[PDB]
Amino acid sequence: AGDDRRINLLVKSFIKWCNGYSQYQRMLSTLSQCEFSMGKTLLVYDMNLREMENYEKIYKEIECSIAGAHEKIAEC
Amino acid sequence: RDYELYKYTCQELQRLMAEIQDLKVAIEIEERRIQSCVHFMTLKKLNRLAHIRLKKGRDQTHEAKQKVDAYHLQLQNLLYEVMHLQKEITKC
Amino acid sequence: LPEARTRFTKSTRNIKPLLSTFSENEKKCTLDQAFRGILEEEIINENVLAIISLAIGGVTSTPFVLLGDVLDCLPLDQCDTIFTFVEKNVATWKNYLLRMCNDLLRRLSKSQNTVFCGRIQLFLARLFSIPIDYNLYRKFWSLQDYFRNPVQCYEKISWKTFLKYSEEVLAVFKSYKLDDKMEELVYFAKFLTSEKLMDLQLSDSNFRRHILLQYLILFQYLKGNYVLTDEQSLWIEDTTKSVYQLLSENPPDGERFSKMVEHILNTEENWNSWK
Known part of the structure; x- marks a missing residue:
């Protein structure tokens, strides 16, 4: 929820400058930080999808190991 | 496409703050303030959508992780049974 | 002002040229944002992430935040390689380390990663x-x-x-x-x-x-x-x-x-x- 507080600080700095070049630099810096956070969120989403694919890959391997283990039980 | 619209609204807000910095008239300042406020509202809506999508993906990973843990627990039970039967036949 | 950050990213693209062309709080802020952009581009593309983190440690709260971002962007095994890198490069180093370790312990499974849970708890015990x-x-x-x-x-x-x-x-x-x-x-x-x-x-x-x-x-x-x-x-x-x-x-x-x-x-x- 820190992006909402960053947006509130950006809106406060915009209202303060609207009523001064250092505040312009601060607005550009907060804009770039919000861009970096929005770029981060999609990478987190893609990482979650890759972990889902990895879990669904491991599940069938555990199925195959159980299928071998039953045969080992019968032979023993 | 959501990230492209995000960066496009950021370019809009950069153009508006460059307009204010070059202008530094009340009607132009009010128009720039209204368009910038529309930009801030779009950015907040996009942030809400991003956090909702991230929480959905996190829960969707967590359920599959729980199921993999349970199925691995059954595999551990069966491997303990195999190991005990093998130790018993090497005893016998 | 974007000319400055493009100048810093041209300075990075290796350590001596970056330290020369990097030549004050806003300058360090643009440096940190440049490292954020470069690490984002390398996450879009493992070892090069470790190279950038070594460069940041050579310059230097920025590497804590950047290691947090890279650990939040990679699925399972690459986080283990980064955690080996953290165990190797201690250098006596706070709160962001605790946040990274808590997010790792929340993200793990405790069926195939119990050894890695033990390593995280050993790291948290070594810090405190x-x-x-x-x-x-x-x-x-x-x-x-x-x-x-x-x-x-x-x-x-x-x-x-x-x-x-x-x-x-x-x-x-x-x-x-x-x-x-x-x-x-x-x-x-x-x-x-x-x-x-x-x-x-x-x-x-x-x-x-x-x-x-x-x-x-x-x-x-x-x-x-x-x-x-x-x-x-x-x-x-x-x-x-x-x-x-x-x-x-x-x-x-x-x-x-x-x-x-x-x-x-x-x-x-x-x-x-x-x-």
């Missing part, structure tokens, strides 16, 4: 059909639930059920009599609470050692409101003298193991006297 007897099953794992909560052994009814169940289980342990050179001819971490097995565990000696040690740890804890009946204390002493005899009856080296248990429990009393 077949016929089945169902009755024995139910009584045994109810005793296990009593072991997991030692506070419950102070009421009347719960203590009476503990007396009955523990005496029945120790009767089974006395009456089975394993008497085992079989061991002369993957690690199971938790107990396997399965109805179907229940007899391959009673034929083992390690399982009996775990249960008798768990009894001894509970009895050493109860010796340290919260009053005890003298009859309960006599029962504790009788069962303690029986459990030491049962540990002496384990076939691999019961007497040496019992002496080890005695000395370790005495030192546990000495340790509990401090705290």
Whole structure:
């Protein structure tokens, strides 16, 4: 929820400058930080999808190991 | 496409703050303030959508992780049974 | 102002040219945003991430945040490689380390990553059909639930059920009599609470050692409101003298193991006297 507080600080700095070049630099810096956070969120989403694919890959391997283990039980 | 619209609204807000910095008239300042406020509202809506999508993906990973843990627990039970039967036949 | 950040990213793209063309708070902020952009571009594309982190450590709260971002962007194995890199590059280094470790411990699975959970906790410590007897099953794992909560052994009814169940289980342990050179001819971490097995565990000696040690740890804890009946204390002493005899009856080296248990429990009393 820190992006909402960053947006509130950006809106406060915009209202303060609207009523001064250092505040312009601060607005550009907060804009770039919000861009970096929005770029981060999609990478987190893609990482979650890759972990889902990895879990669904491991599940069938555990199925195959159980299928071998039953045969080992019968032979023993 | 959501990230492209995000960066496009950021370019809009950069153009508006460059307009204010070059202008530094009340009607132009009010128009720039209204368009910038529309930009801030779009950015907040996009942030809400991003956090909702991230929480959905996190829960969707967590359920599959729980199921993999349970199925691995059954595999551990069966491997303990195999190991005990093998130790018993090497005893016998 | 974007000319400055493009100048810094051209300075990065290796360490000497970056340190030369990097040449004050806003300059360091643009440097940090440049490292954020470069690490984002390299996450979009492992080892190069470690190269950039070494460069940031050569320059220098920015590497904490950047390691947090890279650990939040990579799935499983690359986080393990980065955690090996963190264990190698300590350099005595706060709150962001705790946040990274807490998010890792929340993200893991504890079935295939128990070793990695142990490594994270070491890092945090370094910083700071077949016929089945169902009755024995139910009584045994109810005793296990009593072991997991030692506070419950102070009421009347719960203590009476503990007396009955523990005496029945120790009767089974006395009456089975394993008497085992079989061991002369993957690690199971938790107990396997399965109805179907229940007899391959009673034929083992390690399982009996775990249960008798768990009894001894509970009895050493109860010796340290919260009053005890003298009859309960006599029962504790009788069962303690029986459990030491049962540990002496384990076939691999019961007497040496019992002496080890005695000395370790005495030192546990000495340790509990401090705290």
